[model samples]
Target: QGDIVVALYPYDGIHPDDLSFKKGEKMKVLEEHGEWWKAKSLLTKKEGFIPSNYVAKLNT
Candidate 1:
């Protein structure tokens, strides 16, 4: 399991299946698959893929 992470930049679904999140939104990192990561959103409680470099992990 991965630690919590926060989105640094707002992301609007770029494609039909893309994920979206706002800057400063918190998410729980579920899995890291190569260049992308699967995260669970704290606000909506939804899960989806996110660019690996778009989010920053918290210090805990």
Candidate 2:
């Protein structure tokens, strides 16, 4: 529906079910599930879940 691109950084180690990106990377928000969000990795172009707070708005 309302997909958007955002910057992401997972400082909270790693979660088994959640998708992880580079220490600092960009991803596209695919779906929102409360505290967790489903996104497609911009680097590897893969889809997985990530903490919602982990995503930030890009400067540019």
Candidate 3:
């Protein structure tokens, strides 16, 4: 299974390739890039890149 993460702040995607998420939303990490991570939204079931600093690993 992929790593689970929770958004720390609400983010509005400026580009179509990015993912928009609300604070505290859970996401599945698909790929890790330095400043951007590919993730899938558990709520919306959409996939796109998000800022790495916008989320943190979900606490067990």
Candidate 4:
């Protein structure tokens, strides 16, 4: 019914503040985009940008 969220750290978007914030981690996607997707964090309601290069389409 869904897709797996893999642990990924893009060399481009890593912030020093990221290490403590589950950098390289991934979460389930709730929506899709051409170069981004809507994802909910495991620890917060904060949804943000994640390159499409890092996301795959949900299971059909």
Local error of candidate 2 at residue 53 (angstroms):
1.8
Top candidate, metric TM-score: 3
In lDDT terms, how accurate is model 1?
0.78
For model 1, residues 1-60, the per-residue Cα lDDT tens digits are 676888887788786545677888987877878888777789988777888788887522
The collision pairs in model 2 are none
After superposing candidate 1 on the true structure, give the runs of residues whose Cα lies further than 4 Å from its correct spot: none
Model 3 is weakest, by summed lDDT over 10 consecutive residues, at 51-60
- Which tens-of-lDDT digit does each residue in 1-60 have in candidate 3? 577888877778878988887888988888887777888889998888888888888733
What tens-digit string does per-residue lDDT give for candidate 2 at 1-60? 846556555533365556666545777777888777777776778777777666766734
State model 2's lDDT. 0.66
The pairs that clash in candidate 4 are none
Instruction: State every prediction's TM-score relative to the real structure.
Output: 0.79, 0.66, 0.83, 0.48
Off by over 4 Å in 3: none
Which is the better candidate, 1 or 4, if ranked by TM-score? 1
TM-score: model 3 vs. ground truth: 0.83
Lowest summed lDDT window (length 10), candidate 4: 12-21
Runs in model 4 deviating more than 4 A are: 10-21, 55-60
